Amino acid sequence: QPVIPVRNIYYMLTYAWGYANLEAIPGNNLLDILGYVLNKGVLQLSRRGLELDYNPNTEIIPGIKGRIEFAKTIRGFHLNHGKTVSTFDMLNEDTLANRIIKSTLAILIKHEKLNSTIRDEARSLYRKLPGISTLHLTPQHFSYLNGGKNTRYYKFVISVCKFIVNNSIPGQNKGHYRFYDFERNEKEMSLLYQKFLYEFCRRELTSANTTRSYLKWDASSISDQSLNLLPRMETDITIRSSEKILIVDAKYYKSIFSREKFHSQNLYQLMNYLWSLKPENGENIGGLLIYPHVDTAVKHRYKINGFDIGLCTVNLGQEWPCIHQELLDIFDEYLK
Amino acid sequence: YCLEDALNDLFIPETTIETILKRLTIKKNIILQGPPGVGKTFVARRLAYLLTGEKAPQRVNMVQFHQSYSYEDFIQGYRPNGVGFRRKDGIFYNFCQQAKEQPEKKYIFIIDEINRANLSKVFGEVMMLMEHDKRGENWSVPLTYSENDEERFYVPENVYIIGLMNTADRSLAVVDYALRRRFSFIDIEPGFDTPQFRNFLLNKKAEPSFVESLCQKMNELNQEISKEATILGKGFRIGHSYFCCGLEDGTSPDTQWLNEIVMTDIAPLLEEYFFDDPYKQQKWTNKLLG
Amino acid sequence: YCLEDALNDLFIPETTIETILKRLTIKKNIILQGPPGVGKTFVARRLAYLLTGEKAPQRVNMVQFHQSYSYEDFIQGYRPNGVGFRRKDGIFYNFCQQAKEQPEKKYIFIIDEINRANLSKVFGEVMMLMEHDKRGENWSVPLTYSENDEERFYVPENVYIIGLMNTADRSLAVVDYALRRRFSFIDIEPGFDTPQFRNFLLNKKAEPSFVESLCQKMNELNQEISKEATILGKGFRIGHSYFCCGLEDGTSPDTQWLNEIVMTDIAPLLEEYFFDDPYKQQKWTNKLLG
Amino acid sequence: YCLEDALNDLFIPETTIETILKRLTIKKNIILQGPPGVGKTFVARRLAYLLTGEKAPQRVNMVQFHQSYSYEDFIQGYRPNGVGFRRKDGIFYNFCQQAKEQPEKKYIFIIDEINRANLSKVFGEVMMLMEHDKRGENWSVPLTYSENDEERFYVPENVYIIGLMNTADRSLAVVDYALRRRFSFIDIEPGFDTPQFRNFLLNKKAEPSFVESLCQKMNELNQEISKEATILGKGFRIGHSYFCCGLEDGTSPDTQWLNEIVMTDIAPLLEEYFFDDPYKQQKWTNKLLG
Amino acid sequence: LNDLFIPETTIETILKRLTIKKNIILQGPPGVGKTFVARRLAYLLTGEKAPQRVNMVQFHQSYSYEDFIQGYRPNGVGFRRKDGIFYNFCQQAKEQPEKKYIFIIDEINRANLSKVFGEVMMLMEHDKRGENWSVPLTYSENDEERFYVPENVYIIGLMNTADRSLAVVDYALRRRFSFIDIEPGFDTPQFRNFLLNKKAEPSFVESLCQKMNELNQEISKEATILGKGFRIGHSYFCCGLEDGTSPDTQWLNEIVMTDIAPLLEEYFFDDPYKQQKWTNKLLG
Amino acid sequence: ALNDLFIPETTIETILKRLTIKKNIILQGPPGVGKTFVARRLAYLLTGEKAPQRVNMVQFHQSYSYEDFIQGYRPNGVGFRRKDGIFYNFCQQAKEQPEKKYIFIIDEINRANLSKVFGEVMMLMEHDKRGENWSVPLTYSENDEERFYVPENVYIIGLMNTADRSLAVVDYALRRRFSFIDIEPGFDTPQFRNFLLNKKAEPSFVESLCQKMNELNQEISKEATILGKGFRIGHSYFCCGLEDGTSPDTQWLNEIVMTDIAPLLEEYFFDDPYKQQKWTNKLLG
Ligand SMILES: Nc1nc2c(ncn2[C@@H]2O[C@H](COP(=O)(O)OP(=O)(O)NP(=O)(O)O)[C@@H](O)[C@H]2O)c(=O)[nH]1
Ligand SMILES: Nc1nc2c(ncn2[C@@H]2O[C@H](COP(=O)(O)OP(=O)(O)NP(=O)(O)O)[C@@H](O)[C@H]2O)c(=O)[nH]1
Ligand SMILES: Nc1nc2c(ncn2[C@@H]2O[C@H](COP(=O)(O)OP(=O)(O)NP(=O)(O)O)[C@@H](O)[C@H]2O)c(=O)[nH]1
Ligand SMILES: Nc1nc2c(ncn2[C@@H]2O[C@H](COP(=O)(O)OP(=O)(O)O)[C@@H](O)[C@H]2O)c(=O)[nH]1
Ligand SMILES: Nc1nc2c(ncn2[C@@H]2O[C@H](COP(=O)(O)OP(=O)(O)O)[C@@H](O)[C@H]2O)c(=O)[nH]1
Ligand SMILES: [Mg+2]
Ligand SMILES: [Mg+2]
Ligand SMILES: [Mg+2]
């Protein structure tokens, strides 16, 4: 029942989120890793200073502050008891962005299985933010934050809270939490795999252009022009360069981790993508299937139906730079 | 006031308006809940005249709520003189007193954009009377601003209250507690896949296939929006009124006319919707043009 | 006055300019969304004279929403007199009365940085009334601070409203989808590629290579700006206003002048824009300089 | 007044100063950004009399913004005379009228710590008006609290605006890119490795050996600060003021004098810059002493 | 200069620093006599025991620019512009230039210090004091009417170092203020001499310093969580023995449970054993 | 009164030792502990005269402000006047009598913001700074003729309750100036047992109930995080209904179980009805 060592997965999430030392931390499990960055990351932010958003405040005060709203005062007759309804912009840290972090820290502390040091340090920080109001977290809160007015650094740490919240399970106790066994599910791991690659390819392969391409069937049907019944087809990634175009279909499977029969059903999707796609330049068309393996990496090339197709693997668990080395080495072969 | 004038032009099924007419006589406190551009404001002016059976402005009143709207203007309150403060009868107080004169004739009060202001701040004490069961002079109460307990106000049974609320904003996910008890929510469909909306175009020199081709995509698109719950609920989906307007000249519908709407209205809206996946914008925008 | 007069100096294609009047004449309320420095403020005064057909200021009104405007400021509010308060009709209410003084001649209201203010608060009742269909006496509605005697405020048909929302500040973006249906949104591009911009430089003693080199680099940059959506979206892409001005004295455009621009204005923006790696900052600055 | 009077004590190069007055004469709006202790406040009072060419403080207005500052204070707002409220023309409004009286003479407004207060709310109407090409009566605009449309405010051409913002806090930064466009941003550096800084010390009986040891040290340290732009940008680096003042009595700057200040001021500052690294604090602190 | 438990060198630093720089921040844990130090010290700088010159306030999160400097606030008739204390105080000192007038701000960390000071955050620096540096205030009706700090004014800031708020860091204010740490001073003889001149046992005093130091050093062990700023102050021992009860082991036992025990909880939160351990360590 | 009070005399003796010196004090304990009734008898004890006039009581809430507590402007028939608050009036009453100890009771203090209410005076109530030396003019004191100082005689008691899990860590302001005291329910105390045996209660019935509640009091505090020691039930419910004229009995207790402990038991857990039912059934028999 093997899975990737937990530390390296964090690197994949980083590219997936589009943006540190993990050697120091001794906790193999993920939550020690993720909390340490969050616990440390807030400390990095606080050094520079946390975000302060001008929050308008309209209230009943004993004097003029900012702009008096004449209507609310006269209607409430606050003049008689020497009061006014006035609007002013107090500058606070109680915004949604900051509130999410603080409530998450409660979840992080409440987690049943966690390093002692991480739990202790976070509890300090939780106290260190007295003004902020705790909240009950939902994706709807994170949904509102798609504006991303905050810095690039904030958006990274916020994404971490999204992973924790959704991948938090109550455990033995009603109050405390228990972390999700994320590695076991392939589907999100696959969506991690696909998203990890797409943003990764933009970074390293500056030489080539990397875009996801939607595809349309060559078919015509008398019944419907819509062809809603037909399967929707959107590439995982397309990595187009002047010399050669290349489409990749990659998925995370448990069977392939075993070094026997081979699970390559995704290939069935791939061929039809090649067909429906027509290149104006007509330089060439190439395909690649890349999967994660644990032990070692194996590469083959094939010439199937007039298309040049590669099957390849990566030895995850080796080392992240050598893995980073291997991926760039891989594409150089096929991108030609 | 014939239904034929009322109901022929409309895109809505005759079933739902009848269902609406049922509850409105029954409960008299109703809310139309749908995205903007489906004729919520459009129907309500007609609906008032349906019930009365006549086109009468006096018996029908329309307002739009906003944050500045308050009890003191709505119901009763004090307005400054040059120095002094004079009490003034508000709309609803003045409006009901007309209804008190003629109990038989139905009276209609229409409140658009109700969610923007808290009902309690405006209505307040009168929410007790406003409910359908507790109406009539039996339940009379003296007002906050009444000079004496003798002066009293009761909501007459004849008045019906209509509220037009749009499910297009994130804040409205937490609907106000005041509304839910007292009003009956009804959902208005986008109403693309309807005969009358199509027939409206066909009378306006439209090809059926171009019309029929469009609806599946619009029906397809709104389905995609409703599938989401986190950012965009079912209530956010597109209404049917972008396409209605702009044909007053007689210019025939076509991709040329349609493309103007897509780029100038619907294209940037989708950027706001699909901020996270700009390519998703490209997916649909290219899909619609084709 | 005519289009030839206005489009003499404007860097925009005629294509949008006719599209603008097309949506306006049908819809009567529109918004131009673009980054700062693309002539949004610049076109607006010229646009007003086109529709009236004459260069008249009286029929036009120009304002800016500064996140402190209110319904009391726009429409109706209470102001202190010498000792006691009085009711003052706002500017828009003051404006509409002028527009209905003569329906024949069109009247324009211009609002800079409209996205800042909470539009739902300011307009209130008008948010429905502004739309083209619901105009005139038929849709007269009584205002909040109107006298108890029925006095109603209706948008004249001749009135046209224009909004000017920059695309930089994401937070200050219109999420009032109910309000976004009244308006039609017109994207404006930076204007680099256009010859009408290029001619403006070449007429002003410029090399075609230096001009053609400039547009090539900027267009590369805006793609890279357009590439991202996480932080820096499409809208952030750089305007042409920086290059427009400062040559009135007779200074010919050259790398010296361009170098002054890059170090002084753009180079701060870039480091503010990225704030992740200086290399990207060092890269693109040197690219423009080299 | 004359130019050389200012430059005698100024550590910044004239090259930057010449760049500055060139922009300011053109742009009329500028922003000076650097760490604290580099003479932003110092230069600004000097710079105004340079631009005017005559040492007239009446034509100079100097203010420090902060959270408790608004459009009502700055521009216009209603405030209590006593029993009766009055419209109080804010300080900037009064300043602009003074400059109108003498259009020839340049009038200068100095804003210290501008980045603190919400400029978006404060400037508002001004945010459009202030730009170099939009000044004058042609672009006159009525304000929020203006009695009628005719009452309008236009920035005079003679006015020059100065913006002063520290770069220490990323929290308080001018993220409004539209606001960024009006202002021309000129970075200011600590300028340790300058003659005029050294001449000031040698003039006050300082060892040239100690001086060369001193400037080289900080130059390396400041460069270390700029390196970790993710953590701490170049804007965070130490200014020259700590060493500047404190010798007024005539105390010679020996190594002991420097060792005293480092312990008292820079040492806790260093502790804050390196919260995680105690050795790095120990490294650089010990580096200075030997 | 007699009853002070802080080193004579440390106070000598301050007077030289204060007179020159005119601004300081005195930061330390509670119970180190920050209030008494400055109040003792303030009379030194004046040279006379004058309390009218000296004014003290204790800031708090709700404290505002309305309170400190200026503000619009109601009279019986209505609203008017009300000069806050500092405007009132600086005018009073401006009336008499020669003498040195002092302003003391306690619990300064609580308020958003930038917000409170506002205009004077620039003006307070020693060089920018005078009519040349005057500015019209925020609420000043007229541009010509301005406020400038006089040179005689000197400012003292008292800071609790045990409640860090990771909300706002200002390194510019740090330029205005010269930060001076204060240690509890258990080791100092003046602390010991006070007790031995109160009929304490010689060993009992010596025993206490060993006990406190072992605890205090542990607090400073983990600089990230806690620091020397967190460690315990001495002032709790000063109070309560001037009634006539000389020190005894029982008296020590009272204070540990009375005062320090919550602090331990505050400090060593969710670790009772460490509290029980360190508590019991002192009692033995 | 000591015999009437059910809490340990050592705590009673201990408190008088603290308050006399510290002059500021706050009591945190479960609801139903007679915290108000405790302080009053203690208030009368310290003064020694059983004087209510010296005694003044206040209950805080979130709206409670400086105008309510200290001073504010209230409307006249025409215009408005400065209107003295409770504490301003109360201390000036105490100012005349320096020898006489005057006490102030602040119930539910933790709800309100002390700073917003007290403001300036929040430091002046600290025992070190008392008397005319620390006089300050008030915010609304337009003239400098009069300054407000709390004289030494004043003692301030705050009644706080450990009932609510929603309550987060106490405000930092409170911790500084106040000594925090935990009050026991007092079931084990003989003085409470003599308060039932004086009512002809059965010793078995008396002793069983002490053991019965103690079994619960341990379990409610056994919870690590959600329900602590402060949560555990007090005795005040048991007092009212016995000396009115009706003798103790198990049926009398049986009503009390349903009345207060049963909903309270539901309130604390709010998760498991069986765990409530098991405990409620356990209490009854
Ligand atoms: N002919 C015709 N027009 C319709 C129909 N439904 C809506 N419209 C048109 O759509 C436009 C706006 O309708 P409206 O009621 O204001 O939508 P709304 O729900 O009120 N908008 P909002 O929610 O933003 O307030 C009008 O031109 C209206 O006549 C319809 O069924 N038939
Ligand atoms: N001559 C000329 N100048 C132009 C043109 N377009 C923009 N500019 C110039 O660029 C500067 C700013 O234009 P402006 O309308 O204010 O852009 P904006 O979008 O309104 N600014 P903002 O978004 O910040 O409010 C002015 O000098 C303007 O004249 C143009 O087509 N021709
Ligand atoms: N004598 C002399 N002092 C200088 C010079 N440059 C800066 N200083 C000194 O450094 C101190 C601060 O000047 P200032 O402008 O306020 O620095 P700043 O960047 O504005 N600081 P902040 O942004 O925090 O307000 C003063 O002592 C000032 O005189 C200089 O060239 N000569
Ligand atoms: N004799 C003497 N008393 C001191 C010393 N330090 C503090 N005290 C006394 O301790 C009591 C409380 O001091 P306080 O200012 O409240 O503590 P802090 O503000 O936290 O530093 C007062 O009586 C102080 O004078 C000292 O060094 N010597
Ligand atoms: N006689 C007597 N009554 C007590 C004692 N303790 C509490 N009580 C009674 O319990 C009631 C007050 O309880 P309390 O907790 O203050 O009510 P609460 O303020 O609503 O929580 C009164 O009937 C008190 O007299 C006590 O020790 N002796
Ligand atoms: Mg509507
Ligand atoms: Mg503009
Ligand atoms: Mg400065």
Side-chain angles (χ1 to χ4, degrees), chain B residues 72-90:
Chain B
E72 284 73 356
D73 323 316
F74 198 65
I75 301 174
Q76 271 217 49
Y78 279 86
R79 302 228 172 290
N81 271 340
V83 185
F85 282 25
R86 73 183 177 86
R87 198 174 81 267
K88 159 161 159 183
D89 291 7

Side-chain angles (χ1 to χ4, degrees), chain A residues 190-191 193-199 201-202 209-215 232-240 245-251 273 277, chain B residues 224 274 276-284 286, chain C residues 227:
Chain A
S190 166
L191 180 60
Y193 198 112
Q194 293 199 142
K195 189 149 192 178
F196 158 62
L197 290 193
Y198 170 52
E199 286 293 350
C201 292
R202 320 195 81 199
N209 162 40
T210 63
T211 48
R212 218 165 67 121
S213 72
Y214 192 93
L215 298 182
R232 322 232 69 79
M233 54 197 307
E234 212 163 348
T235 55
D236 178 18
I237 53 167
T238 61
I239 46 171
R240 49 174 42 192
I245 206 178
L246 175 49
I247 178 166
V248 198
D249 286 356
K251 288 190 184 54
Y273 300 145
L277 171 57
Chain B
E224 170 63 3
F274 299 121
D276 57 52
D277 195 332
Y279 183 57
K280 193 159 188 199
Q281 308 160 11
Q282 276 201 61
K283 159 162 170 287
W284 287 101
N286 288 77
Chain C
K227 250 72 169 185

Side-chain angles (χ1 to χ4, degrees), chain D residues 9 11 35-37 39-42 240-241 244-245, chain E residues 127-128 175:
Chain D
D9 197 8
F11 304 156
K40 292 185 275 291
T41 318
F42 186 87
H240 61 240
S241 195
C244 163
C245 291
Chain E
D127 45 8
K128 314 195 183 72
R175 204 177 60 78

Side-chain angles (χ1 to χ4, degrees), chain A residues 40 43-44 47-52 54 56 64-68 70 79 84 87 89-92 128 149 151 153, chain D residues 67 69-70 72 78-80 85 116-118 121 145 168-172 175 230-232 236 272-276:
Chain A
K40 188 198 168 197
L43 180 60
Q44 289 284 328
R47 173 180 300 127
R48 273 166 47 264
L50 311 185
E51 85 175 16
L52 309 177
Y54 280 88
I64 310 300
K65 187 175 278 177
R67 181 183 98 94
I68 60 177
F70 282 118
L79 288 179
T84 53
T87 306
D89 40 358
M90 301 292 290
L91 189 48
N92 303 322
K128 297 226 178 190
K149 175 262 177 176
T151 62
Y153 213 124
Chain D
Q67 304 197 6
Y69 222 121
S70 177
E72 282 68 30
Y78 276 119
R79 290 300 188 251
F85 290 68
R116 264 159 180 74
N118 186 18
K121 189 173 184 105
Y145 289 86
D169 49 356
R170 283 298 305 176
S171 59
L172 319 183
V175 293
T230 68
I231 320 190
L232 307 173
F236 291 64
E272 285 285 293
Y273 287 181
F274 311 100
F275 204 70
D276 306 3

Side-chain angles (χ1 to χ4, degrees), chain B residues 142-207:
Chain B
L143 285 180
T144 294
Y145 292 70
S146 53
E147 48 173 338
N148 57 41
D149 58 355
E150 157 55 7
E151 297 175 2
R152 288 175 171 268
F153 172 89
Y154 67 101
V155 178
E157 61 183 344
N158 56 6
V159 310
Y160 312 80
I161 293 172
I162 308 165
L164 321 177
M165 191 194 73
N166 83 77
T167 56
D169 68 67
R170 304 106 180 253
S171 307
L172 190 44
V174 286
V175 184
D176 298 349
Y177 166 84
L179 300 195
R180 297 180 278 170
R181 300 201 66 259
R182 322 183 197 282
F183 287 103
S184 49
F185 306 142
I186 305 197
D187 291 347
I188 295 282
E189 281 295 85
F192 290 106
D193 56 356
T194 43
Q196 326 204 20
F197 172 51
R198 287 162 183 163
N199 177 285
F200 177 87
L201 288 184
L202 300 185
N203 270 26
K204 292 193 182 293
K205 300 170 186 180
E207 173 154 339

Side-chain angles (χ1 to χ4, degrees), chain B residues 47-214:
Chain B
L47 297 210
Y49 300 135
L50 280 179
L51 269 164
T52 57
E54 181 177 2
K55 285 192 176 179
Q58 43 158 1
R59 284 197 293 285
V60 184
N61 201 314
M62 186 176 207
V63 288
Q64 185 171 273
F65 273 6
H66 49 122
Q67 287 291 356
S68 165
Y69 241 53
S70 48
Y71 181 113
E72 284 73 356
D73 323 316
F74 198 65
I75 301 174
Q76 271 217 49
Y78 279 86
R79 302 228 172 290
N81 271 340
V83 185
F85 282 25
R86 73 183 177 86
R87 198 174 81 267
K88 159 161 159 183
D89 291 7
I91 287 155
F92 204 60
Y93 185 83
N94 204 330
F95 177 63
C96 283
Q97 284 199 342
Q98 300 176 337
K100 292 170 109 297
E101 299 196 354
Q102 304 179 348
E104 61 189 344
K105 309 197 205 159
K106 294 187 189 181
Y107 277 59
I108 304 297
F109 200 76
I110 306 160
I111 302 171
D112 197 351
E113 306 296 356
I114 193 164
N115 78 326
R116 307 211 187 292
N118 184 11
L119 205 74
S120 60
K121 295 189 167 185
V122 186
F123 275 77
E125 161 177 303
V126 177
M127 288 190 319
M128 177 180 182
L129 297 167
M130 161 274 198
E131 320 201 348
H132 77 88
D133 46 4
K134 307 185 168 66
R135 299 210 188 177
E137 190 171 1
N138 172 34
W139 301 76
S140 38
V141 183
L143 285 180
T144 294
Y145 292 70
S146 53
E147 48 173 338
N148 57 41
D149 58 355
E150 157 55 7
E151 297 175 2
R152 288 175 171 268
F153 172 89
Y154 67 101
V155 178
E157 61 183 344
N158 56 6
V159 310
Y160 312 80
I161 293 172
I162 308 165
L164 321 177
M165 191 194 73
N166 83 77
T167 56
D169 68 67
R170 304 106 180 253
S171 307
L172 190 44
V174 286
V175 184
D176 298 349
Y177 166 84
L179 300 195
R180 297 180 278 170
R181 300 201 66 259
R182 322 183 197 282
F183 287 103
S184 49
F185 306 142
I186 305 197
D187 291 347
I188 295 282
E189 281 295 85
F192 290 106
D193 56 356
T194 43
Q196 326 204 20
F197 172 51
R198 287 162 183 163
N199 177 285
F200 177 87
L201 288 184
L202 300 185
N203 270 26
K204 292 193 182 293
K205 300 170 186 180
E207 173 154 339
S209 170
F210 159 59
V211 166
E212 194 79 2
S213 167
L214 165 55

Side-chain angles (χ1 to χ4, degrees), chain B residues 45 64 69 86 88 264-265, chain C residues 23 124-125 138 146-147:
Chain B
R45 211 164 210 241
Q64 185 171 273
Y69 241 53
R86 73 183 177 86
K88 159 161 159 183
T264 65
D265 294 343
Chain C
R23 295 296 295 175
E125 304 263 38
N138 178 22
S146 69
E147 277 288 7

